[PDB]
Amino acid sequence: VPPSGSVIDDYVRNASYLEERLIQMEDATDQIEVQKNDLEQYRFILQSGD
Amino acid sequence: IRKIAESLDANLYDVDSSNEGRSQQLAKVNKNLSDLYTVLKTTSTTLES
Amino acid sequence: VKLVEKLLKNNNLINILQNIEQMDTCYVCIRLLQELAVIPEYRDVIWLHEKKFMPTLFKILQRATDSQLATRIVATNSNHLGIQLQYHSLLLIWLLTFNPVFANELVQKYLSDFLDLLKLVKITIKEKVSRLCISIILQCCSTRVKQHKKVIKQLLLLGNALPTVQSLSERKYSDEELRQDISNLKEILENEYQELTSFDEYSSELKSGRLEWSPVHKSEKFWRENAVRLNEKNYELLKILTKLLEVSDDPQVLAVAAHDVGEYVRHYPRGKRVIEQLGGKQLVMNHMHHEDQQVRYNALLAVQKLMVHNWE
């Protein structure tokens, strides 16, 4: 077994990059629900009450 | 009414008594939901893949 | 000074040096060449003959680039001390370190190999080798000559060494000469990096009609507050870019155009009205329905961040 490449550092940076992007994107499409749900309910009022 | 009902839930709402604004009322957010229906699938697909 | 004239315009010895499968020959020839190079006024005269040998000087290092001579899977890559051939080569390349104007031009012809030399700093375990790599690339820098800044610009353009810069920074080698080498290197390469009051160059790009992924294109370290530039003409400075985006679908420019729009709206939450003037969400979802998944990713990022922080 000889040494492997020291691109360990390359992996450091790129894996960081990718995981921060993951953290950003994951919690983005999450709370869209919190704002859309209230009006998705209010469509009920939009259906009657005149 | 406001300062009494805030305690539980005050999701302020009222329709246009001239009930033809109903049209844009529907559409303005119907388009929004149509739009938002996508982000969910797009994000899920990219992340899982 | 005179014998050398006949010793150089000749061609039989050079024919002897042309071979690649024999190392002793070129080794010793250029080794004695560097030993005599102690007379600095001979690199000058041989300059005109550069294209005859300098590519030969570079072929060995280009082989060394991906060829992992240290990993002895390479059977008989060189004699046990043979690798010192590279040491001597870089020794010579340093011997030409007192005339910058000499280094000034030949670069325009073979900048690429000089660039990808970057790897040698980390690749070679030998201190000498990485040392000479870094020292040569640096000393190319000098206040002595002109255009001594664009070189590092292209360095960042293609290589993006700064990762490598700090990477090698964290692992010094107890060599004072090297300490100063790398210290200079870092400061000299980084201080200009913030040479971006980019209204001028953004305007130049605007009139250029060409866009590309670039730190000049992308650097928020200023955009902390720069909407002032956006304020030139009713925020329409980017509307031209938007209409061009609509015009064609070139991947680089197509993606970058809407890439920073999300950032720019992030800079002003009040810009919802200009955003609805844009109203390109249909175009954005279309971009999520085109090739090059990366640009689709970027378009989704833009639209999602935008909507979310209009209703965060």
Curated annotation (Swiss-Prot), chain A:
Belongs to the V-ATPase 116 kDa subunit family. Residues 18-46 form a coiled coil. The chain holds residues 100 to 149 of 840 of the full protein. It comes from the Eukaryota. Present with 55714 molecules/cell in log phase SD medium. This is V-type proton ATPase subunit a, vacuolar isoform. Glycosylated. It is found in: Vacuole membrane. Subunit of the V0 complex of vacuolar(H+)-ATPase (V-ATPase), a multisubunit enzyme composed of a peripheral complex (V1) that hydrolyzes ATP and a membrane integral complex (V0) that translocates protons. V-ATPase is responsible for acidifying and maintaining the pH of intracellular compartments. Is present only in vacuolar V-ATPase complexes; enzymes containing this subunit have a 4-fold higher ratio of proton transport to ATP hydrolysis than complexes containing the Golgi/endosomal isoform and undergo reversible dissociation of V1 and V0 in response to glucose depletion. It comes from Saccharomyces cerevisiae (strain ATCC 204508 / S288c). Signal peptide: none annotated. V-ATPase is a heteromultimeric enzyme composed of a peripheral catalytic V1 complex (components A to H) attached to an integral membrane V0 proton pore complex (components: a, c, c', c'', d, e, f and VOA1).
Curated annotation (Swiss-Prot), chain C:
Disruption phenotype: Increases the ATPase activity of membrane-detached V-ATPase V1. Abolishes growth at pH 7.5 and in the presence of calcium chloride, abrogates growth at pH 5.0. Signal peptide: none annotated. Transmembrane segments: none annotated. Present with 22500 molecules/cell in log phase SD medium. Belongs to the V-ATPase H subunit family. Subunit of the V1 complex of vacuolar(H+)-ATPase (V-ATPase), a multisubunit enzyme composed of a peripheral complex (V1) that hydrolyzes ATP and a membrane integral complex (V0) that translocates protons. V-ATPase is responsible for acidifying and maintaining the pH of intracellular compartments. This subunit is essential for activity, but not assembly, of the enzyme complex. This subunit is also required for silencing the ATPase activity of V-ATPase when V1 is detached from V0. V-ATPase is a heteromultimeric enzyme composed of a peripheral catalytic V1 complex (components A to H) attached to an integral membrane V0 proton pore complex (components: a, c, c', c'', d, e, f and VOA1). Interacts with YND1. This is V-type proton ATPase subunit H. It is found in: Vacuole membrane. The gene is VMA13.
